[PDB]
Design a protein around this ligand. Sequence first.
Ligand SMILES: Nc1ccn([C@@H]2O[C@H](COP(=O)(O)OP(=O)(O)OP(=O)(O)O)[C@@H](O)[C@H]2O)c(=O)n1
Ligand SMILES: Nc1ccn([C@@H]2O[C@H](COP(=O)(O)OP(=O)(O)OP(=O)(O)O)[C@@H](O)[C@H]2O)c(=O)n1
Ligand SMILES: O=C(O)C(=O)c1cn(-c2ccc(O)c(O)c2)c2ccc(-c3cccc(O)c3)cc12
Ligand SMILES: [Ca+2]
Ligand SMILES: [Ca+2]
Lengths: 212, 229
Amino acid sequence: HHDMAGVKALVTAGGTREPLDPVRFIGNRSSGKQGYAVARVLAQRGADVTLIAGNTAGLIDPAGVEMVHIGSATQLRDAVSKHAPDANVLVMAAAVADFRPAHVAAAKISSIDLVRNDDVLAGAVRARADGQLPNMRAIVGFAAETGDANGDVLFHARAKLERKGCDLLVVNAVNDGWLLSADGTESALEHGSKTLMATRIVDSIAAFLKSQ
Amino acid sequence: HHDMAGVKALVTAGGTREPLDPVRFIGNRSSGKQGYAVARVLAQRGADVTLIAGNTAGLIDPAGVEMVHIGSATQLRDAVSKHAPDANVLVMAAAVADFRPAHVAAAKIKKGASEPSSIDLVRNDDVLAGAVRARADGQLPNMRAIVGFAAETGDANGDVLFHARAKLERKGCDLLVVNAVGENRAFEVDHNDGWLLSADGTESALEHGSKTLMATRIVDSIAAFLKSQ
Ligand SMILES: Nc1ccn([C@@H]2O[C@H](COP(=O)(O)OP(=O)(O)OP(=O)(O)O)[C@@H](O)[C@H]2O)c(=O)n1
Ligand SMILES: Nc1ccn([C@@H]2O[C@H](COP(=O)(O)OP(=O)(O)OP(=O)(O)O)[C@@H](O)[C@H]2O)c(=O)n1
Ligand SMILES: O=C(O)C(=O)c1cn(-c2ccc(O)c(O)c2)c2ccc(-c3cccc(O)c3)cc12
Ligand SMILES: [Ca+2]
Ligand SMILES: [Ca+2]
């Protein structure tokens, strides 16, 4: 019940907000609950946990977890970069905005022109492959996927795993979901409480660290 | 005493979210707490309160208050149209989005490879102003007080009071609550631009204090207006 002792774990959770001006922004409907649950379970099993949190459903800080609060995707990126060097597990559970307004208004206010934000998960994946994160043992991504006219849900999920290159892709089929490993393993994630699904996610992380 | 006994009160609170697709939206940073505080105080003082709530999911429903939930500024508009005939006082405390994306995608907008397009905006209707016009056209015979809220700063073209007076005159509501702001917490600056501006010219200061104390002063302001009539 304490296998993650000595693990430094960095978790992102919640959705980011891309400011239009001091008051208005682009946001999403993500609750952050599953990222917090992974943070709580990680800490419960002995990890030294840092939680980078964007916008959440009123969530209370998990006890024993270092909280770092952020607003935008770019602030998330800098937060991930700042806390990256000593971490052994990166759990990218945040819904990071792909786009942000190019211009932020100085005062209270046409169209909003967009510019792309950095892909932090892929930045972490690339940094580790070029030797800049030797302590990083597990990079975990999240995806909310669905079947559509261009493929079924699981096709899209596999393609996302292949494209991101992370060690584990936790897939939420928008009732059951999936855990896709980079060695090809696929486990169904049965629908239950946020805590029990977090246990299955952390169990998979612990299983990956031992194989390596 | 219980001065708002027999008053039917319709309160809007929180910010709206204007969908870009099922997941993304345009939103603002309004907590909705000052609007809940006015409703709870109204209810505590004997009003029959109906609360139309925007983005306030982690807030607790005020005791004794009929809850109506909405998402976008447009759904707020339709909720106000439905519930306005039962109200004697309209308290427009919601942070209504001024603009809405022109097209709502049926699916999550994927991050592709070509240049990201732009978000076309379209103005939302002024719900408070729609209410002021309805009362003027005879469609709201029960409506006794129309209350608006505004966050006003002082920019290059006037101080808070200039912009606020212009807003009250322009909106046509009976009372304009200006800069009912802050939770009075440590290290939060007080700029003393709090005001209750009536459509008869009276200007009273709104001191910055707790959400409950500003709610009490606002309802006090409402009750004084109902007595004048
Ligand atoms: N700018 C971004 C966006 C994504 N994420 C992370 O990347 C993972 C994949 O998220 P997803 O949105 O599904 O990937 P996308 O490439 O953005 O997929 P799509 O374009 O279909 O939305 C998540 O763990 C998320 O936290 C990230 O680190 N940086
Ligand atoms: N589309 C809108 C705009 C605002 N409101 C209401 O009207 C009041 C005015 O808010 P404010 O944003 O300050 O007024 P605006 O006309 O939008 O002024 P501005 O463009 O400077 O923001 C508030 O009570 C708000 O709930 C509304 O009913 N519908
Ligand atoms: O932590 C949360 O709950 C949360 O807010 C989430 C935000 N994303 C997310 C990521 C990238 C996106 O592009 C996007 O749109 C959303 C999630 C993706 C999957 C899960 C998940 C995983 C297993 C079981 C399960 O039930 C939910 C949770 C979230
Ligand atoms: Ca995305
Ligand atoms: Ca406005």
